[PDB]
């Protein structure tokens, strides 16, 4: 299994919302048996993580018969505007076996209709959180080309985090 590197890591999931960024999405994935696969996607040409996540799948070829959870540590919320959160709610209204988890560094604020992805996928089933400092530092310790390295703490982790996830469960209320 391929690792990133720690700058991208950093780069990427910083969760000060008011930074302006360019609209790339790292999107950290496990799949285990309730038999494992791990990895991660970003933006390619055009094509959201979310949907290449979905293109894969059929890769991983699991069992049709047995029960999934899925876990996305992912950079950004999924967009609504751009048709993520509508193509995840169809995976999941078809394949009822899988139950998702989405924790994210950031809301998808450059998306005017961000609420609704997170309504929409919270309706289809998703549970979806905003990363503490304990999934930042999951992430950096299982995703990132770390070489021992320690996770250390960006300018307002905790800080941003909580404001985020008082906004999420406000939206979700
Ligand atoms: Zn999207």
Same mark, same amino acid.
């Given at each position: ?10 780069? &990427?999931?910083? &969760? ?78 078809? &394949? ?78």
């Amino acid at each position: 299994r391929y690792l990133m590197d720690p700058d991208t890591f950093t780069s &990427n999931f910083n &969760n000060d919302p008011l930074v302006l960024r360019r609209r790339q999405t790292y999107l950290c994935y496990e799949v285990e048996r309730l038999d494992q696969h791990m990895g991660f996607l970003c933006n390619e040409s055009g094509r959201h993580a979310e949907l290449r996540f979905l293109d894969l799948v059929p890769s991983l070829q699991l069992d049709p018969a047995q029960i999934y959870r899925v876990t996305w540590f992912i950079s950004w919320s999924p967009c609504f505007s751009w048709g993520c959160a509508g193509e995840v709610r169809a995976f999941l209204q078809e &394949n009822t076996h899988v139950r998702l988890r989405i924790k994210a560094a950031r809301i998808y604020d450059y998306d005017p209709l961000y609420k609704e992805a997170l309504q929409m996928l919270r309706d289809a089933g998703a549970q979806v959180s905003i990363m503490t400092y304990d999934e930042f530092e999951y992430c950096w310790d299982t995703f990132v080309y770390r070489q021992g390295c320690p996770f250390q703490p960006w300018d307002g982790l905790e800080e941003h985090s909580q404001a985020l996830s008082g906004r999420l469960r406000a939206i979700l209320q």
